Description:
Number of helices of chain A: 5
CATH topology of chain A: Cathepsin B, Chain A
Radius of gyration of chain A: 16 Å
Number of strands of chain A: 10
Oligomer: 2 chains of a larger assembly
Bound molecules: chloride ion
Amino acid sequence: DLPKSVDWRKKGYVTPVKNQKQCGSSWAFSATGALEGQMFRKTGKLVSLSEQNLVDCSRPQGNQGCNGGFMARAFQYVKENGGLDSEESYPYVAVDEICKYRPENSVAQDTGFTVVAPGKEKALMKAVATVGPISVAMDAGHSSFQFYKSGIYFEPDCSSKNLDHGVLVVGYGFEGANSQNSKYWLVKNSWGPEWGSNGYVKIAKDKNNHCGIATAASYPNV
Amino acid sequence: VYEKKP
Ligand SMILES: [Cl-]
Ligand SMILES: [Cl-]
């Protein structure tokens, strides 16, 4: 059955927290985070992937670089493109630039992606427990989120349907000795390690799909 | 509940 808690950071699947800066590229960080987890599961090597490669090259698939995008379109680009470059070979500069994809520097691939369906928290829990980190969209458009520091985040103004930010669910847990209450999703953000709880946020779990975390979740197939 | 910065 499903584990009481999961934290893929403790298993080597997750890279250190990154910073998208003033570019609307959270979708690219969410997609490289999911791909980093799946490549690690497949090869045993954790290699940081290039968000800039996605920002600069995936316009044909429907992404708009620093003006926004979608994780599923990014996984589609990696499939059609045949690869994705490492973060070291194609560094992040937080502005839209010319596509400079280099096949010789590719370190990741995908054949498509799987959508978490239904858009229910229990389905997301199954996906997190069996696959690894999962890309998700959420409603991060709140001052309370910008100033979040620690604890379980809950915001009455949060929408489960109108989402504006891509993040990565790396696990789930609970506070205390009881696994069924004070539950939370472990979410990796892309605002730097100085934001939030070391770059992470605990989003309330089993509180009616709070902030939309299970509404548009997906992961690459590697 | 949850804490805010600093
Ligand atoms: Cl569109
Ligand atoms: Cl998406």
